[PDB]
Design a protein around this ligand. Structure first.
Ligand SMILES: [K+]
Ligand SMILES: [K+]
Ligand SMILES: [K+]
Ligand SMILES: [Mg+2]
Ligand SMILES: [Mg+2]
Ligand SMILES: [Mg+2]
Ligand SMILES: [Mg+2]
Ligand SMILES: [Mg+2]
Ligand SMILES: [Mg+2]
Ligand SMILES: [Mg+2]
Ligand SMILES: [Mg+2]
Ligand SMILES: [Mg+2]
Ligand SMILES: [Mg+2]
Ligand SMILES: [Mg+2]
Ligand SMILES: [Mg+2]
Ligand SMILES: [Mg+2]
Ligand SMILES: [Mg+2]
Ligand SMILES: [Mg+2]
Ligand SMILES: [Mg+2]
Ligand SMILES: [Mg+2]
Ligand SMILES: [Mg+2]
Ligand SMILES: [Mg+2]
Ligand SMILES: [Mg+2]
Ligand SMILES: [Mg+2]
Ligand SMILES: [Mg+2]
Ligand SMILES: [Mg+2]
Ligand code: NA
Lengths: 173, 199, 282, 158
RNA sequence: GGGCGGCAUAUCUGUUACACGACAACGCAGGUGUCCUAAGGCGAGCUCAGUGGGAACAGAAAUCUCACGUAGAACACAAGCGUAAAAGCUUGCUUGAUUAACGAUUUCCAGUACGAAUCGAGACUGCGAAAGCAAGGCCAGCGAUCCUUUGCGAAGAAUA
RNA sequence: AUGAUUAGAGGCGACCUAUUCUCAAACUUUAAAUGUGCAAACAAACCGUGCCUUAGCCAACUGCAAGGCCGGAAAGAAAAGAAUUAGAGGCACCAAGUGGGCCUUCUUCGGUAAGCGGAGCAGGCGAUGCGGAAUGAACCGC
RNA sequence: GAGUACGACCACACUUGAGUGAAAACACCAUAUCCCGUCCGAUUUGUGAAGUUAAGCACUCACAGGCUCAGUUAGUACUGAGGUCAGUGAUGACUCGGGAACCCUGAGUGCCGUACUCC
């Protein structure tokens, strides 16, 4: 039964990622920007493997990211999609029901641009789901979510264009 | 030059393949194991002729290559190259060594050979009923290149398949056979009922 | 295509399914093997676990002996049996956990016949006194079995443990996980632990939620009844007294719904009918 | 083997069977071993503590010592012209109760039950009769055993 | 033959090796004389290698996210074996790598020693709510007589 | 599965999925034959709210563990193919030669091979003639 | 006839699709003052009962894949013992015994305890 209220799609979380790529002053400023944006403490993400072309090395903090849930996540998504002018492409949606977009100007999100920091730009990713995804993340009796209960790409697109009234492009690449 | 093959007959050692323990093995002499119209469908060549070894022995890749070349030359000379398909079954996976009785006499790889058993098919040729004597004479001349004793027989199966010649046409007409390249599989009443296995 | 299928025929051929309870996410078998373990020099003398399991709605406390045929439950107590003693709401809070542990200890000691010999603490103080174990007659001993629960400072599993200890049973423990224990100071605040045991935290939250209500999912059944935040502690005290007075009481006291299995003959007949129908179509 | 370490030549001996990996079960923990019991010394590959030497794998002996986590087993070992009673010390995971006296114990119990029935006057179970005896044979279906041409035609492959 | 070469001179893994154990060659393929206050001990969390879907710069490869993933990764170092709510990875606390009354065993074996290892009994401990686990890093990594050298036999008390 | 390996087929050439030709001392799901431990009633094992002791275990004992004591029953090990024995078992003491081995069935490694070098199980010769293979340490018989 | 907690054996129990599920459970679920822990009450911890069987869970099905037990493969392969057996040999068969494996095909798709609860 699709009409069951437990099948309503909700925003599980909004994940904001700023990949500065080099530790030091830039990463500190990026963490401050994320602290201003998300109203909560972010975390530095350490490099996995040394890549010469990017520098990077290993175990070195190269990015700062944060997870936002609840009302703050929804308002942040509203701001980010307002910046994107409520237009997302078809391939921006994953087959797992999630979608995301990049923002190039941190000062475009209604945030003061006092020159103590600079313009960074970031990554917005939102994860859709339904009430019941606890079964695959709880410690006891952990089990797979039912196949039908998953959020599909078409379901995510319909949720986006019904809730936020956005426009899909139906293009590729 | 190369040693006489009488030194490397008789399968005296445990199998000694090329691996991470035996490095430095030269490539086998025989490279392509199919000649003739290898892309011909299973229905095109109903007659299968075997060269069956009657001895437990080793056959060098040089002998295998020479036999395949001789058989191909005869088949293309006394027939067409599109009316047969011969397959070399034995593969040279056993490495021969040369101590080039002294101390530290364990040798280096100098060749490769196929270890062959009694009743093992060495060469199989798919062909038509018109060119059967040509196939027999080509396989006789190719046998002349091999060591030991081999017999040439005509298979009771259709081509390279495991389906008998008498029953192949009836099975195919009834729809009981699946064509996958140059061999066929008798479709079984099992699995999900699809447009296949309905029979 | 273009993506290799990991779960192919060979993958299933070589798969070794885990134990049923592990694949159900129920039992930690390393912990269970260490818990049912005993000295081989004991030659199988009886050993008991205090099994504490908490659901979304109930608290399950059992005294269990491990056996090869299957574990034997000596005594069981439930949170939903507390209404027989006077606990009408909040059957899953810390106070209900303490009461369930007390009830299980009293029932076990009554069944073993040593109830009059071991009284435990009549009045709960929240204070820690070390249990008396072998490692005057010794108290009945069980070891705590929290299962997969996260053992934090103030979890209700330790509420059940504390209730059982005050009930008379000797469960070896340290106060490091009781609510109110100060990790930095390495000291226990017995007043805070007693407040949790009698649910003054629940009473304070109820008062706050009611004040906000005047200004309704939370405490809906508490507020539907005429439950006052100032009567909770007396209610739990009376519950303790009643549980000690008579632990044997509980709550006051075959149509087939299964689907029949088709036989193999019926499965094959259905399959043959289906293939015949497909043949008739084509 | 090229070296003579403690676990030399145990690649297949101290390996677990296919799809039977994992640590010993609770039934192994709960087994009660007594001094004087007959046990089988079978090394569990996944324990690696208190492991017997490869020689004692598959040997049956008598328990002479029980410790809190170990078992003392006496194993016969032939050395030159004599057999030595070797005392090995292993953990209980590498020990199994031996059914080597199961049939003898059953024989003793059956003899005791037979004596009890003979005392009670109960009728003893009928004695089994020998299957080696003669008798009349009445064949329901008789077939001819012979060699046919088809047997030869079949034993030839291809 | 010896010599040169090499080390088959002490020793570890797989194989030869013939489904108990044992088995030769200057047989085959490789190791050892180290390294680690953590890479030892314990508790708790977590899951690995890869694979797809997706997300500014960002691409085959930088981070984020969702699934699938029986281990195809890791476990100092050679090789097996073993291990998935771990034995792997992170993190917290620690010194069980200390003593250990001449306890008893296995391996080589003459049933001698050494080196490694196993089951214990004491003392003082560490981690853990607890059951428990731990006197190093499982299995290779090491050394007689004689000689040298270091530690222990504090202070006090006893008419003995 | 891990390693190799041939060719067609169905969804640039790969890629994917079903197969297909051929393999492994240092691969293996499976798996013999020959083996190899233990047991098969006289210092034992079996039975008993049997009794005593314990500074052993268990919350306790009448439960368990251990030494005993007192009784019982004993095909003395039935019947089902249901063992056999030129079957005195144990325990020492003192010493000799020997510590170059060779051959063979079967299994086996190095070597093109060798009346070559090197192993396993077991029989031989050495140490042994006699009767046979004309002749031969070892083959056949004894 | 079922449920829950603890289990024993650890696929006949797993995996993939679908469907059905009385009661009570179990679970999704609501929430963050206190106990506790996180970048994030996601996990975890505390407090609680407005909704839902949509998931989990349990059953049922599939000429399903695996798994289990058989048959067949096959008295074949291999093998203990024997010959002054055959054969130049490679190797074979024979005599007295033992005896496989995959493919392929048939059947089946958890079972057994302790305690409490619903029918
Ligand atoms: K020839
Ligand atoms: K250790
Ligand atoms: K020294
Ligand atoms: Mg010449
Ligand atoms: Mg050889
Ligand atoms: Mg734990
Ligand atoms: Mg081997
Ligand atoms: Mg094995
Ligand atoms: Mg062996
Ligand atoms: Mg752990
Ligand atoms: Mg000593
Ligand atoms: Mg020593
Ligand atoms: Mg060591
Ligand atoms: Mg100690
Ligand atoms: Mg080590
Ligand atoms: Mg150790
Ligand atoms: Mg008899
Ligand atoms: Mg001499
Ligand atoms: Mg010689
Ligand atoms: Mg002599
Ligand atoms: Mg003669
Ligand atoms: Mg939550
Ligand atoms: Mg919660
Ligand atoms: Mg449903
Ligand atoms: Mg099937
Ligand atoms: Mg034989
Ligand atoms: Na010295």
């Amino acid at each position: 039964k699709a009409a069951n209220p437990m099948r309503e799609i909700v925003v599980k979380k909004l994940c904001i990622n700023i990949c500065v790529g080099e530790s030091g002053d830039r990463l500190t400023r990026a963490s401050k920007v994320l602290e201003q944006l998300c109203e909560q403490t972010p975390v530095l993400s350490r490099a996995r493997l040394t890549v010469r072309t990017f520098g990077i090395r290993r175990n070195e903090k190269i990015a700062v990211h944060c997870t936002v849930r609840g009302k703050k996540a929804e308002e942040l998504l509203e701001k980010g999609l307002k910046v994107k002018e409520f237009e997302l492409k078809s391939y921006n949606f994953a087959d797992t029901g999630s979608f995301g977009f990049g923002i190039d100007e941190h000062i475009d999100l209604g945030i003061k641009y006092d020159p103590s920091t600079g313009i960074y730009g970031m990554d917005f990713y939102v994860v859709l789901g339904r009430r019941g995804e606890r079964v695959a993340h709880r410690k006891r009796k952990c089990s797979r979510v039912g196949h039908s209960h998953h959020v599909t790409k078409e379901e995510a697109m319909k949720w986006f264009e019904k809730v936020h009234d956005g426009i899909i492009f139906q293009a590729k690449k | 030059a190369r040693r006489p093959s009488r030194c490397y007959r008789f399968c005296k050692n445990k199998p000694y393949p090329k691996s991470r323990f035996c490095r430095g093995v030269p490539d086998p002499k025989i490279r392509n194991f199919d000649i003739g119209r290898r892309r011909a469908t299973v229905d095109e060549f109903p007659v299968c002729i075997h060269v069956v070894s009657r001895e437990l022995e080793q056959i060098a890749s040089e002998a295998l290559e020479a036999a395949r070349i001789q058989a191909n030359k005869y088949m293309v000379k006394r027939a067409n190259k599109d009316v047969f398909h011969m397959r070399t079954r034995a593969h040279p996976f056993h490495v021969l060594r040369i101590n080039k009785g002294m101390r530290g006499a364990f040798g280096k790889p100098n060749g490769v050979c196929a270890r062959v058993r009694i009743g093992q098919i060495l060469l199989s040729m798919r062909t038509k009923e018109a060119y059967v004597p040509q196939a027999f004479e080509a396989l006789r001349r190719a046998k002349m290149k091999f060591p030991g004793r081999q017999i040439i027989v005509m298979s009771k199966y259709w081509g390279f398949t495991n389906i008998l010649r008498t029953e192949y046409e009836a099975l195919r007409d009834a729809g009981k056979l699946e064509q996958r390249g140059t061999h066929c599989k008798l479709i079984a009443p099992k699995g999900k009922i699809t447009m296949r296995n309905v029979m | 295509p273009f993506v290799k299928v990991v779960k192919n025929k060979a993958y299933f051929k070589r798969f070794q399914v885990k134990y049923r309870r592990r694949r159900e996410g129920k039992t930690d078998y390393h912990a269970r093997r260490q818990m049912v373990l005993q000295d081989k020099t004991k030659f199988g003398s009886p050993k008991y676990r205090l099994v504490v399991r908490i659901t979304n709605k109930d608290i399950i406390a059992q005294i269990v002996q491990a056996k090869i045929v299957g574990d034997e439950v000596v005594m069981a107590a439930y949170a939903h049996e507390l209404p027989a003693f006077g606990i009408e709401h909040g059957l899953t809070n810390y106070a209900a956990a303490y009461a369930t542990g007390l009830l299980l200890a009293r029932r076990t000691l009554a069944k073993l016949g040593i109830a009059d010999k071991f009284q435990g603490a009549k009045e709960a103080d929240g204070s820690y006194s070390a249990v008396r174990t072998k490692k005057e007659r010794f108290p009945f001993k069980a070891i705590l079995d929290v299962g997969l629960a996260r053992t934090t400072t103030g979890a209700r599993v330790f509420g059940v443990l504390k209730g059982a200890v005050d009930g008379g049973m000797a469960v070896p423990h340290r106060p490091n996980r009781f609510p109110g224990y100060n990790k930095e100071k390495s000291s226990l605040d017995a007043k805070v632990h007693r407040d949790r045991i009698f649910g003054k935290h629940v009473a304070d939250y109820l008062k706050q939620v009611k004040e906000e209500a005047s200004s309704c999912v939370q405490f809906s059944k508490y507020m539907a009844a005429k439950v006052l935040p100032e009567s909770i502690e007396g209610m739990y005290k009376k519950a303790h007294a009643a549980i000690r007075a008579d632990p044997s009481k509980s709550l006051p006291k075959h149509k087939s719904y299964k689907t029949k299995k088709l036989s193999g003959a019926e499965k094959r007949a259905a399959a043959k009918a289906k293939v015949a129908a497909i043949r008739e179509r084509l | 083997v090229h070296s003579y370490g403690y676990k030399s030549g145990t690649r297949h001996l101290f390996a677990k069977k296919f799809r039977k990996h994992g640590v010993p079960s609770v039934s192994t923990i709960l087994t009660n071993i007594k001094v004087g019991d007959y046990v089988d010394v079978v090394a569990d590959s996944a324990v690696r503590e208190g492991m017997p030497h490869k020689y004692y794998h598959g040997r049956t002996g008598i328990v002479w010592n029980v410790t809190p986590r170990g078992v003392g087993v006496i194993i016969n070992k032939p050395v030159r012209t004599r057999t030595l009673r070797k005392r090995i010390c292993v953990r209980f995971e590498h020990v199994r109760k031996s059914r080597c006296q199961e049939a003898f114990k059953a024989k003793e119990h059956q003899f005791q039950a037979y004596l009890a029935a003979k005392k009670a006057g109960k009728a003893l179970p009928p004695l089994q009769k020998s299957s080696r005896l003669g008798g009349i044979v009445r064949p329901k279906n008789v077939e001819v055993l012979a060699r046919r041409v088809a047997d030869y035609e079949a034993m030839v492959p291809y």
